[PDB]
Amino acid sequence: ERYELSEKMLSACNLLKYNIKDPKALASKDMRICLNTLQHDWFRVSSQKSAVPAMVGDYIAAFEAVSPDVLRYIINMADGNGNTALHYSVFHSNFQIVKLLLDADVCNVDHQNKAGYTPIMLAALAAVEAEKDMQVVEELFSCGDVNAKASQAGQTALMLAVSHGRIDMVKGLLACGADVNIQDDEGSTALMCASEHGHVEIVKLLLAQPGCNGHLEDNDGSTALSIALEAGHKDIAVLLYAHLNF
Protein backbone atom coordinates (compact mmCIF):
# COMPACT_ATOMS: atom_id res chain seq x y z
CA GLU A 1 0.00 0.00 0.00
CA ARG A 2 2.13 2.85 -1.33
CA TYR A 3 1.36 6.53 -0.77
CA GLU A 4 0.53 8.33 -4.01
CA LEU A 5 1.22 11.93 -5.01
CA SER A 6 -1.76 14.26 -5.32
CA GLU A 7 -2.77 15.27 -8.84
CA LYS A 8 -1.56 18.85 -8.44
CA MET A 9 1.74 17.61 -7.01
CA LEU A 10 2.26 15.09 -9.83
CA SER A 11 1.37 17.66 -12.50
CA ALA A 12 3.60 20.22 -10.78
CA CYS A 13 6.38 17.64 -11.05
CA ASN A 14 5.51 17.17 -14.73
CA LEU A 15 5.80 20.91 -15.40
CA LEU A 16 9.07 20.91 -13.47
CA LYS A 17 10.42 18.12 -15.68
CA TYR A 18 9.14 20.05 -18.70
CA ASN A 19 11.04 23.22 -17.81
CA ILE A 20 13.87 22.10 -15.49
CA LYS A 21 16.38 22.76 -18.28
CA ASP A 22 14.79 26.10 -19.13
CA PRO A 23 15.99 29.01 -16.92
CA LYS A 24 13.79 31.72 -18.47
CA ALA A 25 10.71 29.50 -18.22
CA LEU A 26 11.60 28.59 -14.62
CA ALA A 27 11.85 32.26 -13.66
CA SER A 28 8.50 33.20 -15.20
CA LYS A 29 5.65 34.23 -12.88
CA ASP A 30 3.21 31.35 -13.40
CA MET A 31 5.96 28.74 -13.23
CA ARG A 32 7.12 30.31 -9.96
CA ILE A 33 3.54 29.98 -8.70
CA CYS A 34 3.70 26.30 -9.64
CA LEU A 35 7.10 25.82 -7.96
CA ASN A 36 5.73 27.55 -4.86
CA THR A 37 2.77 25.18 -4.67
CA LEU A 38 5.16 22.25 -5.16
CA GLN A 39 7.61 23.48 -2.51
CA HIS A 40 4.87 24.11 0.05
CA ASP A 41 3.60 20.60 -0.64
CA TRP A 42 7.07 19.05 -0.27
CA PHE A 43 7.80 20.83 3.01
CA ARG A 44 4.31 19.98 4.26
CA VAL A 45 5.02 16.31 3.60
CA SER A 46 8.67 16.02 4.66
CA SER A 47 9.52 18.75 7.16
CA GLN A 48 6.73 18.91 9.75
CA LYS A 49 7.09 17.19 13.13
CA SER A 50 4.25 14.78 12.32
CA ALA A 51 5.80 13.76 8.99
CA VAL A 52 5.63 10.08 8.00
CA PRO A 53 8.70 8.12 6.79
CA ALA A 54 6.83 5.74 4.46
CA MET A 55 5.03 8.67 2.82
CA VAL A 56 8.30 10.55 2.27
CA GLY A 57 9.96 7.44 0.84
CA ASP A 58 7.07 6.76 -1.53
CA TYR A 59 7.13 10.42 -2.57
CA ILE A 60 10.86 10.23 -3.26
CA ALA A 61 10.31 7.08 -5.32
CA ALA A 62 7.59 8.89 -7.29
CA PHE A 63 9.81 11.95 -7.76
CA GLU A 64 12.51 9.75 -9.25
CA ALA A 65 9.81 8.00 -11.28
CA VAL A 66 9.00 11.34 -12.90
CA SER A 67 12.68 12.26 -13.27
CA PRO A 68 15.91 12.00 -11.23
CA ASP A 69 16.44 15.69 -12.00
CA VAL A 70 13.03 16.40 -10.47
CA LEU A 71 13.95 14.37 -7.38
CA ARG A 72 17.25 16.22 -6.95
CA TYR A 73 15.52 19.57 -7.52
CA ILE A 74 12.75 18.96 -4.99
CA ILE A 75 14.87 17.29 -2.30
CA ASN A 76 17.24 20.27 -2.15
CA MET A 77 14.52 22.92 -1.99
CA ALA A 78 14.99 25.49 0.78
CA ASP A 79 12.49 27.81 2.44
CA GLY A 80 12.81 31.51 3.26
CA ASN A 81 15.22 30.71 6.08
CA GLY A 82 17.49 28.60 3.88
CA ASN A 83 16.28 25.44 5.61
CA THR A 84 15.89 22.24 3.60
CA ALA A 85 14.04 19.01 4.39
CA LEU A 86 17.26 17.60 5.87
CA HIS A 87 17.47 20.54 8.28
CA TYR A 88 13.92 20.04 9.57
CA SER A 89 14.32 16.26 9.63
CA VAL A 90 17.35 16.58 11.88
CA PHE A 91 15.77 19.35 13.96
CA HIS A 92 12.60 17.32 14.58
CA SER A 93 14.63 14.18 15.31
CA ASN A 94 12.80 12.40 12.49
CA PHE A 95 15.89 10.34 11.73
CA GLN A 96 14.03 7.75 9.66
CA ILE A 97 13.29 10.59 7.25
CA VAL A 98 16.91 11.76 7.57
CA LYS A 99 17.96 8.25 6.56
CA LEU A 100 15.54 8.29 3.63
CA LEU A 101 16.97 11.60 2.42
CA LEU A 102 20.53 10.27 2.73
CA ASP A 103 19.68 7.06 0.86
CA ALA A 104 18.39 9.19 -2.02
CA ASP A 105 22.05 10.04 -2.70
CA VAL A 106 21.10 13.36 -4.30
CA CYS A 107 20.76 15.29 -1.05
CA ASN A 108 23.05 18.28 -0.51
CA VAL A 109 24.17 17.29 2.98
CA ASP A 110 26.37 20.36 3.52
CA HIS A 111 23.83 23.10 2.77
CA GLN A 112 24.02 26.00 5.22
CA ASN A 113 20.78 27.75 6.10
CA LYS A 114 20.62 31.54 6.39
CA ALA A 115 21.39 31.23 10.10
CA GLY A 116 24.66 29.68 8.94
CA TYR A 117 24.33 26.12 10.21
CA THR A 118 24.46 22.74 8.44
CA PRO A 119 22.32 19.65 9.14
CA ILE A 120 25.36 18.14 10.89
CA MET A 121 25.71 21.14 13.20
CA LEU A 122 22.01 20.81 13.98
CA ALA A 123 22.56 17.10 14.65
CA ALA A 124 25.33 17.91 17.12
CA LEU A 125 22.66 19.51 19.32
CA ALA A 126 19.76 17.22 18.41
CA ALA A 127 17.87 14.94 20.79
CA VAL A 128 18.83 11.32 20.13
CA GLU A 129 16.58 8.80 21.88
CA ALA A 130 17.51 5.31 20.68
CA GLU A 131 20.62 3.72 19.16
CA LYS A 132 19.00 3.62 15.72
CA ASP A 133 18.74 7.40 15.75
CA MET A 134 22.40 7.73 16.71
CA GLN A 135 23.31 5.34 13.88
CA VAL A 136 21.49 7.63 11.45
CA VAL A 137 23.28 10.60 13.04
CA GLU A 138 26.69 8.99 12.55
CA GLU A 139 25.83 8.12 8.95
CA LEU A 140 24.98 11.81 8.47
CA PHE A 141 28.30 12.78 10.08
CA SER A 142 30.21 10.46 7.75
CA CYS A 143 28.27 11.52 4.65
CA GLY A 144 28.74 15.28 4.89
CA ASP A 145 31.46 17.74 5.86
CA VAL A 146 31.88 17.03 9.57
CA ASN A 147 34.56 19.74 9.76
CA ALA A 148 32.46 22.56 8.32
CA LYS A 149 32.30 25.87 10.20
CA ALA A 150 29.19 27.89 11.02
CA SER A 151 28.91 31.30 9.35
CA GLN A 152 28.35 33.24 12.58
CA ALA A 153 31.23 32.33 14.90
CA GLY A 154 33.08 29.74 12.82
CA GLN A 155 31.86 26.95 15.09
CA THR A 156 32.19 23.32 14.02
CA ALA A 157 29.83 20.52 15.05
CA LEU A 158 32.48 19.24 17.47
CA MET A 159 32.80 22.65 19.13
CA LEU A 160 29.02 22.93 19.51
CA ALA A 161 28.78 19.42 20.98
CA VAL A 162 31.65 20.15 23.39
CA SER A 163 30.21 23.52 24.44
CA HIS A 164 27.06 21.81 25.71
CA GLY A 165 28.97 18.92 27.27
CA ARG A 166 27.47 16.23 25.05
CA ILE A 167 29.90 13.35 25.69
CA ASP A 168 28.24 10.72 23.48
CA MET A 169 27.84 13.22 20.65
CA VAL A 170 31.54 14.10 20.91
CA LYS A 171 32.34 10.38 20.79
CA GLY A 172 30.20 10.05 17.67
CA LEU A 173 31.79 13.05 15.96
CA LEU A 174 35.27 11.74 16.74
CA ALA A 175 34.31 8.31 15.43
CA CYS A 176 33.21 9.96 12.19
CA GLY A 177 36.46 11.84 11.58
CA ALA A 178 35.88 15.24 13.18
CA ASP A 179 39.09 17.29 13.28
CA VAL A 180 40.05 18.26 16.84
CA ASN A 181 42.60 20.94 15.95
CA ILE A 182 40.26 23.20 13.97
CA GLN A 183 39.92 26.75 15.34
CA ASP A 184 36.93 29.11 15.31
CA ASP A 185 36.73 32.88 14.68
CA GLU A 186 38.30 33.55 18.08
CA GLY A 187 40.99 30.92 17.52
CA SER A 188 39.38 28.60 20.06
CA THR A 189 39.53 24.81 19.80
CA ALA A 190 37.26 22.11 21.19
CA LEU A 191 40.01 21.42 23.73
CA MET A 192 40.01 25.03 24.92
CA CYS A 193 36.21 25.03 25.16
CA ALA A 194 36.17 21.79 27.16
CA SER A 195 38.90 23.14 29.43
CA GLU A 196 37.03 26.39 30.06
CA HIS A 197 33.66 24.73 30.69
CA GLY A 198 35.39 22.09 32.80
CA HIS A 199 34.38 18.93 30.95
CA VAL A 200 36.97 16.45 32.22
CA GLU A 201 35.74 13.41 30.27
CA ILE A 202 35.55 15.42 27.04
CA VAL A 203 39.08 16.74 27.63
CA LYS A 204 40.22 13.12 28.05
CA LEU A 205 38.39 12.19 24.84
CA LEU A 206 40.04 14.97 22.84
CA LEU A 207 43.53 14.38 24.24
CA ALA A 208 43.23 10.68 23.41
CA GLN A 209 42.84 11.51 19.71
CA PRO A 210 46.03 11.00 17.64
CA GLY A 211 47.57 14.35 16.75
CA CYS A 212 45.62 16.49 19.20
CA ASN A 213 47.53 19.78 19.30
CA GLY A 214 47.48 21.37 22.74
CA HIS A 215 49.99 24.03 21.70
CA LEU A 216 47.37 25.99 19.73
CA GLU A 217 46.51 29.47 21.01
CA ASP A 218 43.38 31.59 20.66
CA ASN A 219 43.50 35.22 19.51
CA ASP A 220 44.35 36.28 23.07
CA GLY A 221 47.36 33.96 23.09
CA SER A 222 45.70 31.55 25.51
CA THR A 223 46.25 27.80 25.37
CA ALA A 224 43.91 25.15 26.78
CA LEU A 225 46.35 24.84 29.69
CA SER A 226 46.34 28.55 30.56
CA ILE A 227 42.56 28.60 30.16
CA ALA A 228 42.14 25.62 32.49
CA LEU A 229 44.48 27.20 35.05
CA GLU A 230 42.73 30.56 34.78
CA ALA A 231 39.31 28.94 35.21
CA GLY A 232 40.44 27.04 38.31
CA HIS A 233 40.16 23.58 36.76
CA LYS A 234 43.33 22.10 38.22
CA ASP A 235 42.71 18.44 37.32
CA ILE A 236 42.20 19.35 33.66
CA ALA A 237 45.26 21.59 33.93
CA VAL A 238 47.32 18.63 35.15
CA LEU A 239 45.95 16.47 32.32
CA LEU A 240 46.90 19.10 29.74
CA TYR A 241 50.31 19.74 31.29
CA ALA A 242 51.12 16.03 31.36
CA HIS A 243 49.99 15.87 27.74
CA LEU A 244 52.09 18.82 26.54
CA ASN A 245 55.34 18.25 28.41
CA PHE A 246 56.08 14.52 28.36
Binding site: H87, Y88, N113, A115, L122, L125, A126, A127, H164
Partner: protein, 212 residues
Protein backbone atom coordinates in the same frame (compact mmCIF):
# COMPACT_ATOMS: atom_id res chain seq x y z
CA UNK B 1 10.25 66.95 25.95
CA UNK B 2 13.01 68.24 23.66
CA UNK B 3 11.37 67.22 20.38
CA UNK B 4 8.72 69.18 18.49
CA UNK B 5 6.66 66.88 16.27
CA UNK B 6 3.68 65.07 17.81
CA UNK B 7 1.35 62.93 15.69
CA UNK B 8 -2.15 62.05 16.91
CA UNK B 9 -2.76 59.24 14.42
CA UNK B 10 -1.13 55.93 13.48
CA UNK B 11 -2.14 56.68 9.89
CA UNK B 12 0.28 59.61 9.77
CA UNK B 13 3.20 57.82 11.44
CA UNK B 14 4.47 56.62 8.05
CA UNK B 15 4.05 52.95 8.97
CA UNK B 16 3.74 50.08 6.49
CA UNK B 17 0.19 48.93 5.81
CA UNK B 18 0.93 45.51 7.32
CA UNK B 19 1.99 47.01 10.64
CA UNK B 20 -0.99 49.38 10.59
CA UNK B 21 -3.38 46.49 9.97
CA UNK B 22 -1.74 44.62 12.84
CA UNK B 23 -2.18 47.64 15.10
CA UNK B 24 -5.86 48.20 14.35
CA UNK B 25 -6.56 44.46 14.51
CA UNK B 26 -4.82 44.24 17.89
CA UNK B 27 -7.30 46.67 19.42
CA UNK B 28 -5.71 50.12 19.24
CA UNK B 29 -7.47 53.24 17.96
CA UNK B 30 -5.67 56.51 18.64
CA UNK B 31 -2.11 56.64 20.04
CA UNK B 32 -1.49 57.74 23.63
CA UNK B 33 0.72 60.81 24.14
CA UNK B 34 3.93 58.80 24.60
CA UNK B 35 3.51 57.08 21.22
CA UNK B 36 2.52 60.34 19.54
CA UNK B 37 5.72 61.97 20.77
CA UNK B 38 8.24 59.13 20.68
CA UNK B 39 7.40 56.70 17.86
CA UNK B 40 8.60 58.73 14.85
CA UNK B 41 12.05 59.85 16.04
CA UNK B 42 12.65 56.30 17.28
CA UNK B 43 12.05 54.89 13.80
CA UNK B 44 14.35 57.65 12.55
CA UNK B 45 17.10 56.02 14.62
CA UNK B 46 17.68 58.62 17.32
CA UNK B 47 18.72 57.60 20.82
CA UNK B 48 15.65 57.98 23.04
CA UNK B 49 14.99 58.36 26.77
CA UNK B 50 11.38 57.91 27.89
CA UNK B 51 10.15 58.48 31.44
CA UNK B 52 6.56 57.30 31.85
CA UNK B 53 4.63 55.21 34.37
CA UNK B 54 3.84 51.52 33.89
CA UNK B 55 0.49 51.69 32.12
CA UNK B 56 0.85 54.68 29.81
CA UNK B 57 1.31 52.58 26.66
CA UNK B 58 5.09 52.23 26.81
CA UNK B 59 5.36 48.78 25.22
CA UNK B 60 3.51 49.57 22.00
CA UNK B 61 5.85 52.51 21.36
CA UNK B 62 9.13 50.64 20.89
CA UNK B 63 7.15 47.62 19.66
CA UNK B 64 5.87 49.69 16.72
CA UNK B 65 9.22 51.42 16.20
CA UNK B 66 11.11 48.11 16.11
CA UNK B 67 8.51 46.34 13.95
CA UNK B 68 8.72 49.21 11.45
CA UNK B 69 12.53 49.26 11.51
CA UNK B 70 12.95 45.55 10.71
CA UNK B 71 14.25 44.45 7.31
CA UNK B 72 12.20 41.26 6.96
CA UNK B 73 14.25 39.70 4.14
CA UNK B 74 17.30 39.85 6.40
CA UNK B 75 17.16 36.56 8.29
CA UNK B 76 19.20 37.76 11.25
CA UNK B 77 18.70 39.38 14.65
CA UNK B 78 18.18 43.13 14.28
CA UNK B 79 16.61 44.20 17.57
CA UNK B 80 17.37 43.37 21.20
CA UNK B 81 15.00 44.17 24.07
CA UNK B 82 15.74 43.76 27.77
CA UNK B 83 13.25 43.27 30.61
CA UNK B 84 13.55 42.89 34.41
CA UNK B 85 11.53 39.65 34.55
CA UNK B 86 10.51 36.58 32.55
CA UNK B 87 6.82 37.46 32.66
CA UNK B 88 7.42 40.95 31.31
CA UNK B 89 9.64 39.63 28.51
CA UNK B 90 6.95 37.10 27.55
CA UNK B 91 4.35 39.87 27.64
CA UNK B 92 6.46 42.10 25.37
CA UNK B 93 7.00 39.18 23.00
CA UNK B 94 3.26 38.49 22.90
CA UNK B 95 2.55 42.15 22.13
CA UNK B 96 5.23 42.33 19.42
CA UNK B 97 4.02 39.11 17.78
CA UNK B 98 0.43 40.36 17.98
CA UNK B 99 1.21 43.71 16.33
CA UNK B 100 3.21 41.85 13.68
CA UNK B 101 0.61 39.20 12.90
CA UNK B 102 0.39 40.59 9.37
CA UNK B 103 4.09 41.36 8.85
CA UNK B 104 6.14 38.16 8.95
CA UNK B 105 8.75 39.06 11.56
CA UNK B 106 10.03 36.66 14.21
CA UNK B 107 10.24 37.34 17.95
CA UNK B 108 11.96 35.05 20.45
CA UNK B 109 12.03 35.31 24.25
CA UNK B 110 15.29 34.82 26.17
CA UNK B 111 14.11 33.65 29.58
CA UNK B 112 15.88 31.51 32.18
CA UNK B 113 13.21 28.85 32.62
CA UNK B 114 14.05 27.14 29.34
CA UNK B 115 16.44 24.36 28.36
CA UNK B 116 19.52 25.98 26.81
CA UNK B 117 20.14 23.20 24.26
CA UNK B 118 16.72 23.20 22.57
CA UNK B 119 16.64 27.01 22.51
CA UNK B 120 20.05 27.06 20.83
CA UNK B 121 18.85 24.53 18.25
CA UNK B 122 15.82 26.73 17.54
CA UNK B 123 18.25 29.63 17.05
CA UNK B 124 20.31 27.43 14.73
CA UNK B 125 17.20 26.94 12.62
CA UNK B 126 16.36 30.64 12.51
CA UNK B 127 17.98 33.79 13.87
CA UNK B 128 14.95 35.72 15.20
CA UNK B 129 14.43 39.26 13.86
CA UNK B 130 13.65 40.40 17.39
CA UNK B 131 15.03 39.04 20.66
CA UNK B 132 13.47 40.04 23.98
CA UNK B 133 14.46 38.74 27.40
CA UNK B 134 16.27 39.04 30.71
CA UNK B 135 19.77 40.64 30.85
CA UNK B 136 21.47 37.54 32.27
CA UNK B 137 20.10 35.08 29.70
CA UNK B 138 20.55 37.52 26.81
CA UNK B 139 24.17 38.12 27.79
CA UNK B 140 24.55 34.36 28.20
CA UNK B 141 23.52 33.87 24.58
CA UNK B 142 25.74 36.73 23.41
CA UNK B 143 28.77 35.43 25.30
CA UNK B 144 28.35 31.86 24.05
CA UNK B 145 28.30 33.31 20.52
CA UNK B 146 24.83 31.84 19.90
CA UNK B 147 23.32 35.31 19.50
CA UNK B 148 25.09 37.61 17.04
CA UNK B 149 25.41 41.41 17.48
CA UNK B 150 26.43 41.81 13.83
CA UNK B 151 23.03 42.98 12.57
CA UNK B 152 21.64 44.38 15.82
CA UNK B 153 20.90 48.08 15.31
CA UNK B 154 18.27 48.45 18.04
CA UNK B 155 18.84 48.17 21.79
CA UNK B 156 15.82 48.69 24.06
CA UNK B 157 15.98 48.77 27.86
CA UNK B 158 12.46 48.39 29.24
CA UNK B 159 12.13 49.51 32.87
CA UNK B 160 15.83 50.20 33.49
CA UNK B 161 15.28 51.09 37.15
CA UNK B 162 13.73 47.65 37.69
CA UNK B 163 16.63 45.82 36.04
CA UNK B 164 19.11 47.81 38.13
CA UNK B 165 17.09 47.22 41.30
CA UNK B 166 17.44 43.48 40.69
CA UNK B 167 21.16 43.89 40.02
CA UNK B 168 21.48 43.53 36.25
CA UNK B 169 23.95 46.42 35.97
CA UNK B 170 26.95 44.23 35.15
CA UNK B 171 24.92 42.35 32.53
CA UNK B 172 23.72 45.55 30.86
CA UNK B 173 27.26 46.95 30.66
CA UNK B 174 28.52 43.60 29.32
CA UNK B 175 25.85 43.64 26.62
CA UNK B 176 26.94 47.19 25.79
CA UNK B 177 30.41 45.70 25.37
CA UNK B 178 28.95 43.04 23.08
CA UNK B 179 26.88 45.29 20.80
CA UNK B 180 28.21 47.53 18.03
CA UNK B 181 28.95 51.20 18.73
CA UNK B 182 26.53 52.38 16.03
CA UNK B 183 23.63 50.62 17.77
CA UNK B 184 20.60 52.84 18.40
CA UNK B 185 19.70 52.98 22.09
CA UNK B 186 16.25 53.43 23.64
CA UNK B 187 15.64 53.43 27.40
CA UNK B 188 12.36 53.33 29.31
CA UNK B 189 12.21 53.97 33.05
CA UNK B 190 9.61 55.31 35.48
CA UNK B 191 12.22 56.59 37.92
CA UNK B 192 15.61 58.11 37.09
CA UNK B 193 18.16 57.13 39.77
CA UNK B 194 21.91 57.78 39.49
CA UNK B 195 22.69 54.49 37.74
CA UNK B 196 20.11 54.95 34.96
CA UNK B 197 21.29 58.50 34.30
CA UNK B 198 24.87 57.20 34.33
CA UNK B 199 24.12 54.56 31.69
CA UNK B 200 22.27 57.07 29.50
CA UNK B 201 25.17 59.52 29.84
CA UNK B 202 27.77 56.86 29.04
CA UNK B 203 26.29 55.10 26.02
CA UNK B 204 23.70 57.41 24.44
CA UNK B 205 24.43 60.34 22.12
CA UNK B 206 22.17 63.39 21.67
CA UNK B 207 19.06 61.57 22.92
CA UNK B 208 15.42 62.61 22.64
CA UNK B 209 14.18 63.01 26.22
CA UNK B 210 10.45 62.69 26.91
CA UNK B 211 8.55 63.01 30.19
CA UNK B 212 4.93 61.96 30.73
Amino acid sequence: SNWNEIVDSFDDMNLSESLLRGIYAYGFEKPSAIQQRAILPCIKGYDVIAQAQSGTGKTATFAISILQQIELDLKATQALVLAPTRELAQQIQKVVMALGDYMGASCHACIGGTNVRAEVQKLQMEAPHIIVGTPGRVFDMLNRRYLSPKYIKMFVLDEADEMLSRGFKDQIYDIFQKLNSNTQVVLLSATMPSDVLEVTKKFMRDPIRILV
